[PDB]
Amino acid sequence: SGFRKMAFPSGKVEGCMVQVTCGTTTLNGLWLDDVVYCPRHVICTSEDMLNPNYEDLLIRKSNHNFLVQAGNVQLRVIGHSMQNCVLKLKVDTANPKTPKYKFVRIQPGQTFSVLACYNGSPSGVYQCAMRPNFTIKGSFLNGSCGSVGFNIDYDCVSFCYMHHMELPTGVHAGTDLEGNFYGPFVDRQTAQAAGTDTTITVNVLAWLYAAVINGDRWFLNRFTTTLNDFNLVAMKYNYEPLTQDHVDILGPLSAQTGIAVLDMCASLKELLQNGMNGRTILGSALLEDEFTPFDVVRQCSGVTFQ
Amino acid sequence: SGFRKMAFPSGKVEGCMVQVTCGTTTLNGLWLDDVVYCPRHVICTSEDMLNPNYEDLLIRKSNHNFLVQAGNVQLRVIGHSMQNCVLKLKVDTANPKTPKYKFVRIQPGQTFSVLACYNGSPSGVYQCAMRPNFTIKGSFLNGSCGSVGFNIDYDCVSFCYMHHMELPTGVHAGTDLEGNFYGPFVDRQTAQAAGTDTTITVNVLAWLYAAVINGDRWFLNRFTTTLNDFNLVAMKYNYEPLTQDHVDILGPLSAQTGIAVLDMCASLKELLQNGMNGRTILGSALLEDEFTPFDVVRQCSGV
Ligand SMILES: *[C@](O)(C(N)=O)[C@H](C[C@@H]1CCNC1=O)NC(=O)[C@H](CC1CC1)n1ccnc(NC(=O)OC(C)(C)C)c1=O
Ligand SMILES: *[C@](O)(C(N)=O)[C@H](C[C@@H]1CCNC1=O)NC(=O)[C@H](CC1CC1)n1ccnc(NC(=O)OC(C)(C)C)c1=O
């Protein structure tokens, strides 16, 4: 009972967070086995940031210019390399708290938890989605760079995001753990703007199913719709196209509630056309689009991690 | 920048969660030192749950009836006792991951993180306020009982809530870690209901400050209100009276933004009277009251 925006338990990731310092610059790194991953811009001064040549700047560094701290233990750096926009520091000590992990690249619409960190110390955890415009709506102050996003599957931590920068309007951009940016952004202090964002339609539908599961049913109407006719209406409200794959993905929640996906689509079509008229759904006055179908099932069925 | 509902990192608490089974009931316990804390209704059969005589039920139990598992490992129960609505199971092994901790009783309007768990295994983390009506708007399924709420200050975990029950409307009730319920609720199967709730005024003002700090400033206006005139309006909308103590508590946010509390109050009055006319604040179309002044400072400064 109840429905809440919920993050994964963060403990397995907390035990991987370190502080990385290069000259004057400090930010966070991810310690897994005998490697620390962090944003490559740790090697820049503020001077360099307008248009840094990272290959050149790194050549001029040595292992000893990297101070890595795990709490109050310094980790000795014995190698370094750059992969895209991440720096990999080889250290002489493997992290005893390394979880089972993998590195994944997520798609727009997918959600994940962020462990916000400062100076290598976890400070808070919250749930985000990769927006269609390849930004995230995060909460990040100076010092947060190198904080990561992740999912847990059973015992396995999938790292999908490392934080690098803030864009206009206070949204955020970063890379996968191979250092490739999500979106067309670059790690440079230069004019960049996100494209126009859109609503993640499949997620709105997941959350309408969540609503029904939790006893909110006022928006259910007597109609069905074709996929085509739904998309005609939804594109007019800056909604992402709903695909057959999305319809297929919503199948389990459809069967659970006994409301056909295209019947839910017809309800959403009416909500877009007529508004919510001051009413709320699951305690929100807007349609929520940062719960995936999986997120809904997970929360409504109580799936667990150890 | 940016402003998100944010829970504390849950690792220190995760290291304390165990599974407790008695008979056919399995739920969660909190393992600190050599004691496991859980809801006493773990000892009930469903027929007991009508008006359980806990004292007498517990006398009939053996330490052997309590199956406590921490991951793979069975913890032998060597002692049991009861404190209000909480059961304490002494075990023969002290939790090596016990953090620095305290048990606190939270006040209505204050917030805490919940670690929802099932079968002693962590499921998820989220933030709740203790409502004025002594409920929390949580997300809990069968098996979640014994999940706890907490705040972390530096390295010290302040435990403030343990989960016992759901109420009509899909809200939740529970106890402090001494087993005393928040609100007038009782741990038995009997029809119970939350009283009428009120909106935490000071928290709404904190969140409006958070909005301004993050550059969302459209609702600011050149007007001010007296404290009394503010309360006359807001109390019509079932907002808690704003006291001078509240105004004082907001002083750091007032100072950070340069907006006096009674200036911000004029925004709030106008939002209540006229609504948002299609606009949002920090991406919400409603006024949010589950962020404390501390939560906003913490998040807009980065502790
Ligand atoms: C990161 O370097 C750190 N040490 O924490 C930092 C994190 C940001 C600080 C405020 N919010 C953040 O998310 N990143 C940066 O400061 C980047 C570094 C660049 C290599 C990527 N950075 C530098 C300069 N400017 C910006 N943003 C900016 O100008 O924002 C506007 C467009 C909104 C004005 C930036 O992110
Ligand atoms: C808890 O015992 C557990 N094993 O997890 C459980 C948690 C709830 C189940 C669904 N979501 C929860 O939060 N608690 C209960 O089942 C309590 C036990 C009572 C001693 C306190 N309980 C028992 C009976 N009824 C209710 N409430 C109830 O039926 O609420 C309705 C009217 C909204 C359906 C209850 O919480």
Author numbering:
A (entry chain A): 1 to 306
B (entry chain B): 1 to 303
Sentences reproduced from the published study:
In order to investigate whether a reduction of electron density in the aromatic ring might strengthen interactions with Glu166, we targeted the synthesis of the corresponding pyrimidone and pyrazinone analogues. The analogues 9c and 9d featured electron-deficient pyrimidone and pyrazinone heterocycles, respectively, and 9b was substituted with fluorine at the 5-position. The pyrimidone 9c and the pyrazinone 9d inhibited Mpro with IC50 values of 210 nM and 380 nM, respectively, and thus were nearly equipotent to the pyridone 13b that displayed an IC50 value of 380 nM.
The main protease Mpro is a clinically validated target to treat infections by the coronavirus SARS-CoV-2. Mpro cleaves the two polyproteins pp1a and pp1ab, which are translated from viral RNA, at 11 conserved sites and is essential for viral replication and multiplication. The active site of SARS-CoV-2 Mpro features a catalytic dyad comprising Cys145 and His41, with Cys145 being covalently bound to the N-benzyl-α-ketoamide in 13b. We established structure–activity relationships for the 13b series by modifying residues at the P1′, P3, and P4 sites.
